[PDB]
Design a protein around this ligand. Structure first.
Ligand code: NAP
Ligand code: NAP
Ligand code: NAP
Ligand code: NAP
Ligand code: EVZ
Ligand code: EVZ
Ligand code: EVZ
Lengths: 248, 248, 249, 248
């Protein structure tokens, strides 16, 4: 039978492109979402029309709290209850906003560290405990070492996620589970950003002066879960058109 | 008058060695402690005997919680109240223990991410808000990229701490605040670990097959706070005897 | 029209698996070799039997010297003379042996730094000069460059230089639409010499499967990078190392 | 007697500041130079005026060739001939100019790769072969991962020098020789540069909107050769005011 994948924050944007590309490769997909319920159900419907009983949704808030572990347990459980197996976990869901050093701060920590690092950890624990080509792909950030000003908690979260990628690749390799990352530079710009600001970002990209397409990001996820990456674990592939190489 | 420093987890081992050497260089010091009251006061007594009214203690639990922000504020305020200024923050306090992927998990999160990463971030915000040779030094880990097996939350917390070092260096540079790290390899072994497990580590180190003393760590701290490091920010200095260069 | 690729040191092991998989993908190939003539011809004959006029051989020493620039220009030229285009350059050839700090030393320099770094730079200049489209370069790097083997300083210097080239060439050629990327094996095909008991010390240190990568596993990452699936990727180095580089001493 | 140091390219700018500061710390110095014979002899006169017999000059072209190993051996021999010992090597000499992918290219390679990497290797070999606080410091480049457009051979040379720092720290640590780097960002700008272009670069630096003084670079060199860095090997200290953390 067909393998199954969980993609977090899969209702729109890069998570959607990834669930669709996994679905096109033959996977059954759990579309996780938090607030985007209409967008999630609509995607599951399109995918089920293409092949029936191959897509389900699963709602979960990935903010850190004492119940996050149970919510991450239930996301993985949802894949096993729908499809009988869980081959691939893509940790895509992310909160992203400025937290200047100079919402309560404890809420900012919970959301930016929770969604970007703690939930990927707890999902990776549940995915491994609930156990062919098993892998986890984490959506990292190619500019983690050249951070945007006033985004310390988001940068902290994405650095922690690099640590999780390495530590989990190390500890899960004996179980045959690979863990790798895909690190966009600028890809789909934030919905609220003006065209003028989007073009200042585009102009910085050496390869094409444009942002990555969602499909370009999904291609590298597709590679790392494929049998063409069967010896790759602990690797983070930048998909950034050279942006991280550009000096100030 | 003289400059003042805060050192977190300063009662024992590396934090004590940092407190002593800052004090020897002429700083007044706040010795932070959580459980080690006796040891903290005993250090403050030794320093005040050398120079009166130059060392105070400050109790706080650095576990992440709804009150960590208030505790981190209090640590910084206690330097301002005692000494009228706060020139240096050394984020030294740290929890360390394994968290296998296959104490509640949210308690391990609160300790290993709370004290290793979130408290430094909150201390950094309070230190900056309350503001010269100002600087922060974070105690990082030289082996962050070749992590110990089953130490994924610890490793996540130390990677987050590298993220904080870089983001805070960029964001506070405009205020003349430098932010740097010191990354020990094997230093003072965890007090629990036996002498057979401890000499295995000692034999792997290129430089003299021995752990770093705490004072070797404090030496790099002293350099980074000095007038000799006035253009250095966002740098992490490994002090590991070459251990991180050794392949598997 | 089928695209064309140069693979350096393609007669055997990894560069041979790269040439074959590029050929399977529809590429015409220049099989560069230094001393391995019989193996290079035999590969070109196998590939030509699969599809006529799709493989040629090109002999060249990539040791650093006064003539290396001309040699590297000739390798690139051979691809254009054979196939009328050159889409892909794979810098795979490498010298590799210990150079303790404590052959003359200048020969060691010429061979380790020439093959691992200077020949790739010269081939990259020659490849780009001849273009000015899915054009790309892939450099074979080394996942253990920051945890080097003892007494391999010149080899380690050569492979770090190669990282620099990968990054610098990515930035400088990105306006011509040429992408530059690397693949960094950890332990793959072990040296022909080596006893099984020494090969087993290496295999046992790999977290993922306690075995070395096959040449084909490394070629797979090369194929990905030159493919339309990697169209936005430049300046990136993919480790293909079973988690080896994550393992502390 | 007093320890002795070799500083390559020590006649002008940063190598001169390093030679001065080592001398001020008590070292006798070999001032290596290539073309700047007048400035070298003039610095050695100034040092000897301050303590007689504590400075010599040594002329040598560090371009790669079949006689580079003999020239590097001669630089080390000259320190032994003048002072009877050689405690510290600083690899500071460097060629720097663009080499666009699209003088002969064989000359570009010889000068940029010879001076920045091969000469350091050969000097390191000669230093070690001729042998209580021995150490080598390589002048690296903080921007080596975000290179200047058209500087591939320079950047290749500087990357190689990081490889040399690590490999030689590992292989020489059993002889008690430490090897480390110091990585300027923007420090003394090239003489050839106009003042408008100088200012563009200054405005990029987060800490102060200014270039490093040569003395600030030398300070980090003094630290790595000092008794306070005795457990530090294989480390590279960036001295860049935050420049490498700034995104495009
Ligand atoms: N876009 C880029 O240019 C870029 C650049 C660098 C890195 N990345 C990384 O690439 C990944 C995908 O980027 P993207 O732009 O597609 O992401 P995004 O649109 O910013 O977020 C994707 C989804 O994350 C989920 N999310 C946010 N807060 C959450 C919470 N508290 N609980 C559960 N889910 C939550 C949301 O689901 P709902 O909508 O269902 O609420 C959201 O649609 C992210 O990890 C991102 O950081 C993106
Ligand atoms: N020792 C090494 O070899 C080594 C290796 C790698 C990295 N490091 C880094 O170097 C730094 C100092 O190392 P160390 O071995 O001296 O550290 P440690 O003994 O493990 O802990 C240092 C101090 O941190 C405080 N601490 C722990 N949990 C806390 C909590 N929940 N709240 C408040 N304080 C807490 C303790 O204070 P009280 O005792 O007052 O309760 C303790 O004295 C650490 O940041 C560490 O990660 C050290
Ligand atoms: N095998 C591994 O585990 C491993 C690990 C890390 C990195 N790598 C990298 O992956 C690549 C392929 O590895 P490999 O094991 O297949 O390579 P290899 O067998 O050591 O060398 C590849 C070919 O390099 C060519 N070569 C050597 N010296 C040369 C010179 N002076 N001029 C021209 N060509 C020369 C030889 O061609 P002739 O036979 O025709 O003389 C040789 O067959 C290399 O860049 C290597 O550094 C491999
Ligand atoms: N300055 C900066 O902003 C900056 C930034 C990053 C890194 N760095 C690094 O820091 C170090 C010192 O910087 P700098 O600006 O002082 O250097 P510099 O002025 O460019 O050069 C230092 C000296 O190197 C010597 N040199 C050049 N070609 C040589 C050859 N073929 N043989 C022997 N010596 C040769 C020259 O000696 P003579 O004058 O005697 O001929 C020159 O004075 C360099 O390694 C550099 O790459 C500097
Ligand atoms: N606001 C901004 O100043 C701002 C800052 C950076 C970028 C780069 S693009 C990006 C990076 C991470 C990420 N992470 C996500 N979850 S979306 C995203 C989108 C866009 C907007
Ligand atoms: N001899 C040895 O001690 C020795 C040292 C390392 C390895 C790792 S495997 C490798 C790495 C780079 C490379 N580079 C090449 N060209 S082959 C190769 C093969 C094998 C043998
Ligand atoms: C010598 O060639 C020339 O006369 C011109 C001036 C430099 N050019 C530049 O674009 C350019 C690029 C980068 C910097 C950063 S500061 C630095 C970095 C490493 C380094 N390394 C050294 N050895 S000095 C140095 C100085 C300054 C200038 C154009 C060509």
């Amino acid at each position: 039978e067909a393998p199954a994948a969980v993609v977090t924050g899969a209702a729109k944007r890069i998570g959607r492109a990834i669930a669709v590309k996994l679905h096109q490769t033959g996977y059954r997909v759990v579309i996780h979402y938090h607030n985007s319920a209409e967008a999630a159900v609509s995607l599951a419907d399109e995918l089920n029309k293409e092949r029936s009983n191959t897509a389900v949704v699963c709602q979960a808030d990935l903010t850190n709290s004492n119940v996050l572990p149970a919510s991450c347990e239930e996301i993985i459980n949802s894949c096993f209850r729908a499809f009988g197996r869980c081959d691939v976990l893509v940790n895509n869901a992310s909160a992203f906003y400025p937290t200047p050093l100079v919402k309560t701060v404890e809420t900012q920590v919970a959301e930016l560290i929770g969604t970007n690092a703690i939930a990927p950890f707890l999902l990776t624990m549940s995915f491994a405990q609930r156990q062919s080509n098993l892998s986890i792909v984490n959506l990292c950030d190619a500019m983690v070492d050249q951070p945007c000003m006033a985004f310390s908690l988001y940068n902290m979260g994405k650095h922690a996620l690099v640590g999780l990628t390495q530590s989990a690749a190390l500890e899960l390799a004996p179980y045959g589970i690979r863990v790798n990352g895909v690190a966009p530079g600028v890809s789909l710009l934030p919905v609220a950003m003006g065209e003028e600001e989007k073009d200042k970002w585009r102009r910085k990209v050496p390869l094409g002066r444009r942002e990555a397409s969602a499909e370009q990001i999904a291609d590298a996820v597709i590679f790392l879960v494929s049998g063409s990456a069967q010896y790759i674990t602990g690797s983070i592939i930048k998909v950034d058109g050279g942006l991280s190489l550009v000096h100030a």
